[PDB]
Amino acid sequence: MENFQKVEKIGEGTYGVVYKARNKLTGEVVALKKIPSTAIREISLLKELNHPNIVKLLDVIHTENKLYLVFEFLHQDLKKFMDASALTGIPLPLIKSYLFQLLQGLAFCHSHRVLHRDLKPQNLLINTEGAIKLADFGLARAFGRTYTHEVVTLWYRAPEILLGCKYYSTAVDIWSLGCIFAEMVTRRALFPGDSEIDQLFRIFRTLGTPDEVVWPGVTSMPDYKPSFPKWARQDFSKVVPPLDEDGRSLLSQMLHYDPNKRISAKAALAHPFFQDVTKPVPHLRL
Ligand SMILES: O=C(O)c1ccc(C(=O)Nc2cc(C3CC3)[nH]n2)cc1
């Protein structure tokens, strides 16, 4: 760490503090995250998982029982960009470009059997060129409230996780990305739960209480209760106006209850919603 000069604190992650820093050897500006042997091996496998839509893991430094992850630096996150675009909304061509790029990122990681598990706007990073990249890919499998006691958000958690499936699939990331897509369109979180049951019931109130018809095996899941209230499903036309029919079709497939029915990232890239995809330049002031 004597090779790095901390510039400023940029955030507080799930695992630890994130700093903007300068590498004294190469002159490189980086993001530094301050965090057992199985974790070292798993994190080292992530240095190989390189893609233009994945924030690059430059190095892993293990010194004096402290773990530092050195990443490529990006100047803004999607949470801040959405907050900044609250009054006007992010233009549809830019939402479409970001969704397409994130699906390319997911298709790559999923093809290597790597899941993110905790996608949220805070870990989607953007640059001036129109790119968007996934941060913290693979860290959940390695490390499992934050270190500052901040509550870890449940808003993007898939229903199978909330229902106690411990052997969940790549479909959990498609659910989270569908929640983010809906939030970019409407300018409001889709399911802003503030407890596990509030999160589940917000999902049920919009998509209908799941049953054996729509999700075979649901009633036998660990945290499923026959006493859950039975809510009827809402039309997507009410949930995400003014999204067009192609976008609503794709969103519905990303939010299917059964993880086996939920669209894969690869199949989502072929959806007609992306027929007219482009790569616009966002409005960024840094
Ligand atoms: O509002 C701002 O100034 C601002 C600046 C930087 C960021 C940001 O998280 N950057 C990062 C993080 C990472 C990897 C995952 C460690 N790389 N780059 C977010 C907001």
Side-chain angles (χ1 to χ4, degrees), residues 1 3-5 7-11 13-23 25-33 35-63 65 67-229 231-282 284-286:
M1 311 311 298
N3 295 289
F4 300 90
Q5 196 147 87
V7 172
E8 63 184 344
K9 190 167 158 173
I10 63 170
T14 320
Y15 318 108
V17 61
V18 191
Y19 301 103
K20 179 176 188 182
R22 181 178 307 277
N23 186 321
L25 287 156
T26 61
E28 203 172 19
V29 162
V30 302
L32 287 186
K33 192 165 298 233
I35 317 283
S37 300
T38 56
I40 307 299
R41 306 193 186 103
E42 185 56 57
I43 308 294
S44 298
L45 301 172
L46 303 169
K47 299 188 283 169
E48 287 203 301
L49 189 75
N50 298 320
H51 184 273
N53 300 106
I54 299 304
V55 176
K56 188 174 173 58
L57 172 56
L58 306 176
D59 266 303
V60 179
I61 305 166
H62 184 29
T63 44
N65 303 344
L67 186 63
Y68 306 87
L69 304 184
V70 189
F71 284 101
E72 159 190 20
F73 180 79
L74 288 91
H75 291 81
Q76 196 163 109
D77 64 57
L78 185 71
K79 186 184 183 288
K80 183 178 179 180
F81 186 67
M82 283 200 295
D83 282 351
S85 312
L87 294 188
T88 56
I90 299 160
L92 176 68
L94 187 59
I95 296 175
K96 185 176 295 193
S97 171
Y98 283 169
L99 180 66
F100 189 70
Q101 287 180 71
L102 294 167
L103 288 164
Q104 290 176 56
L106 264 71
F108 173 77
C109 289
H110 292 172
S111 79
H112 292 285
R113 316 302 314 134
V114 177
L115 290 67
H116 187 297
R117 304 173 174 83
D118 194 24
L119 286 179
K120 59 194 150 195
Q122 305 96 280
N123 55 36
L124 299 180
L125 304 179
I126 60 170
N127 67 21
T128 54
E129 317 280 8
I132 186 165
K133 302 198 191 195
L134 300 136
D136 291 2
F137 235 102
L139 307 188
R141 195 166 129 91
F143 315 109
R145 312 291 198 87
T146 75
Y147 77 118
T148 54
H149 321 283
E150 191 175 280
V151 176
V152 176
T153 192
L154 302 172
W155 301 357
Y156 310 93
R157 188 169 287 181
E160 58 272 31
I161 299 175
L162 291 163
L163 293 170
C165 179
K166 282 188 176 183
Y167 307 95
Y168 49 82
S169 74
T170 57
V172 302
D173 294 331
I174 293 297
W175 177 275
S176 302
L177 185 57
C179 289
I180 294 169
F181 175 26
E183 182 171 346
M184 288 192 280
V185 172
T186 65
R187 314 172 222 172
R188 188 155 293 177
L190 184 57
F191 306 129
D194 65 347
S195 71
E196 294 190 40
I197 205 64
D198 186 64
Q199 186 68 34
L200 272 169
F201 292 178
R202 280 177 174 273
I203 297 166
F204 295 177
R205 283 190 281 263
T206 296
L207 303 173
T209 300
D211 62 13
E212 289 289 334
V213 174
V214 302
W215 190 352
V218 71
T219 69
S220 301
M221 299 183 73
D223 303 313
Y224 176 90
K225 307 289 170 189
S227 58
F228 287 157
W231 286 288
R233 184 175 179 92
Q234 288 184 9
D235 294 351
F236 276 51
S237 60
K238 186 194 162 80
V239 187
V240 288
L243 194 58
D244 65 50
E245 206 73 56
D246 285 324
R248 296 193 324 265
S249 161
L250 173 61
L251 180 63
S252 73
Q253 298 196 286
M254 298 179 75
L255 298 180
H256 277 318
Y257 269 126
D258 186 349
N260 199 65
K261 292 185 186 73
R262 204 172 297 151
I263 198 164
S264 65
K266 195 165 172 181
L269 291 166
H271 194 278
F273 185 59
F274 301 114
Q275 179 260 348
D276 63 350
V277 71
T278 65
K279 196 188 182 171
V281 172
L284 292 183
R285 280 286 91 88
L286 308 168

